[PDB]
Point group: C2
Chain length 76, copies 2
């Protein structure tokens, strides 16, 4: 829930459990539109560094969820 990406600190990311051999989290673009815009323009094939509840982690862009207007990111 405590997520930092670059200069952005958000507390409304949704960290999902481990499903299908993968862990993901969703960033709500209606709440965090500046971060989502940066994710849109992010270099392809490049990781997104993140601090997850204090733990430095690596995220990858997985899918833009049109139904919920959220960036779905893959952990690790």
């Amino acid at each position: 829930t405590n997520v930092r990406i670059g200069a952005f600190e958000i507390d409304d990311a949704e960290l999902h459990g481990e499903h299908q051999g993968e862990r993901t989290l969703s960033i709500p673009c209606k709440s965090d539109p500046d971060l989502c815009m940066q994710l849109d323009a992010w270099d392809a094939d490049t990781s997104v560094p993140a601090i997850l509840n204090g733990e430095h982690s690596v995220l990858y862009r997985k899918h833009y969820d049109r139904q919920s207007d959220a960036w779905v990111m893959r952990l690790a």
Copy 2:
């Protein structure tokens, strides 16, 4: 590159209008070049149309897919 599009408060000249292909026509909006428009596309009301002026003609678009390879919002022409 050769397509003018007006959506909301934005007017771009670098969208790419693809030909009809597998029964639909799509338009790519490059978010590395038009990031403020892409921000408004991100938060658009889901399953609502996106009115647009496309090469000077009124048109209806729908969000299709965010293309991670090309960093572009791919839209479907109604």
